[PDB]
Amino acid sequence: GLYDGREHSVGC
Amino acid sequence: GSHSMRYFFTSVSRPGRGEPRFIAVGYVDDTQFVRFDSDAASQRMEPRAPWIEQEGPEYWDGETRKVKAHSQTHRVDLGTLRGCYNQSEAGSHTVQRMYGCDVGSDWRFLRGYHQYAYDGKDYIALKEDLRSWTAADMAAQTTKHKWEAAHVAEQLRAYLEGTCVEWLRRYLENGKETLQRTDAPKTHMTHHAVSDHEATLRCWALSFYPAEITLTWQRDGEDQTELVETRPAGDGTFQKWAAVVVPSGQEQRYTCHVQHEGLPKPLTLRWEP
Amino acid sequence: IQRTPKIQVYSRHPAENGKSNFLNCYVSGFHPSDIEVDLLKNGERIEKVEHSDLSFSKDWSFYLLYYTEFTPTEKDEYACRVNHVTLSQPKIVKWDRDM
C-alpha cells in the first residue's frame, strides 16, 4: 500500500 | 525474525523527447510484489507476485491512483530543482525517493524511514525519531523550513506508524507460504591453480533466502580475501562466493564459516579432496 | 556524481551440457540510469532477453538483471556487452563456468 494524503513538493 | 516493506521511486528527465520516465517498484523484505512504468501500455499498477493477484479491483484502482499522484509531484520537483541550480535545459537529471517501515518478531512498529535524493547525492531525510529533517545545503535548509511550517512530518508519521504496519501484516498473513520461509544454503568449495606454488580456494553458497549471509575465512583461527556482491539467481534465491589466495602445501589449515538465518548451527568447511 | 558499473555473468543452476538453463548478467553500482546491456552468443546478439525493473541500493546506485534461456554446449561461447557513459569503450565479459 502506497502513501495517501497531501503530497508535498520541494521549494527552492 | 524481522520484516520490512519498502518502496522505490525514480524519475529520469528527458528534454525535448516528451515526458520524464517514471518507474516505481515495491518490495516486501526481499520479494518484489508490484511495479509501475510510465512507458508500458498498461498504465496500471501491475502485480508481480502470486499472493497479490488475489486482491479486489478497488485495491488496484486505489494503487494506480496513488502511484499516478506521486509522479505528478516528481515531475514538478525536477523542474524546480533544475531552475534553482542555474543548470542548463538540455541535460538529464534524476530524482529518487524511498520509504518504508520495519516490524519485529512480534509484528509491531520498530522503525521508519523516508529519504530523498538528487543526482545521487543525499538531499533531505527524516530522522530516526520521525520528527525532524536532515538538510545538506542551503537548498535543503529552505525546503526544510517550508516543510516544517506545514507539519509535513506529522502527516507522514501517522502513515508509517499505522497504515504501513497494517498493510505489512496483511501481506505477511496472506502470502505465508512464500514470505515466511527460510532456505538453507547449499555449500561447496573448489580449487584453482594460479601458479606452481600458489592456489585459490573458494567457498560457494547457492540458493538461499533471504539475502543476508556472511562468509569468512580463518587461517586456523584468525580472521582476514575478495568477496562479491550477493547476486540474485533470478527465481527468488541468491548466491555468493568468497576466495582467499594461499601458498600451496598449506590447504588443510583453512576453514570457511557459513552463517545464515536458515541454519540452526554454524557450518564449517574444510578441504577434503 | 557518476559511477561505473560492475558486471557479473553467471548461470542460474550449475551448468551441465544439454540441460535447459538460464544466463544472467547482473550489473550494479552505476549512475545515472541509462545503460545498454546485451547478451552475446558467439559474438552475435540474442533477440529474446528480458530484464527486471530499475531499483537502487542504500547509496542511490542502480542495479539491473538481464537474463535469457539457453542450453549449454561445449562448443559455444556466451558473453555480455555493456556500454555506459563513464566507459570510454564497451566492456565484453565472458562466461567462465566457475564464476
Residue numbers in the entry:
A (entry chain C): 1 to 12
B (entry chain A): 1 to 224, 228 to 276
C (entry chain B): 1 to 99
Per the authors:
The recognition of antigenic peptide-MHC (pMHC) molecules by T-cell receptors (TCR) initiates the T-cell mediated immune response. TCRs are expressed as heterodimers of α/β or γ/δ chains in complex with three CD3 dimers (CD3εδ, CD3εγ, CD3ζζ) that are responsible for initiating downstream signaling. Here, we report cryoEM structures of two distinct full-length α/β TCR-CD3 complexes bound to their pMHC ligand, the cancer-testis antigen HLA-A2/MAGEA4 (230–239). We also determined cryoEM structures of pMHCs containing MAGEA4 (230–239) peptide and the closely related MAGEA8 (232–241) peptide in the absence of TCR, which provided a structural explanation for the MAGEA4 preference displayed by the TCRs.
